[PDB]
Amino acid sequence: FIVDVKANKHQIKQAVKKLYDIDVAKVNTLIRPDGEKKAYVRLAPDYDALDVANKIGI
């Protein structure tokens, strides 16, 4: 995901749950050199990234 730079890792970990109703294993972040924040979110081993991608549209 692409996140605004004010948000930290705990707030991303809460926001992904409170929008998509799926757990968060852990969160890596980096500052993409264009200026935004690129956040990798690993899901729980129960869920499916393919199903979540199909249900968010990508």
């Binding site: 500052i31 050199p33 264009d34 200026g35």
Partner: protein, 50 residues
Amino acid sequence: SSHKTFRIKRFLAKKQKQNRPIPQWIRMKTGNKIRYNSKRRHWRRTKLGL
């Protein structure tokens, strides 16, 4: 310099946002006489200096 403080990355981020040419639908507007980015920057000839 491969590790640098955060203000420098915001500055370099806005400069990478600046460094891009003119889209073509602006060139055919009404009353426009802009033909190219005169403010275009090449990384060998001009150095911004932080």
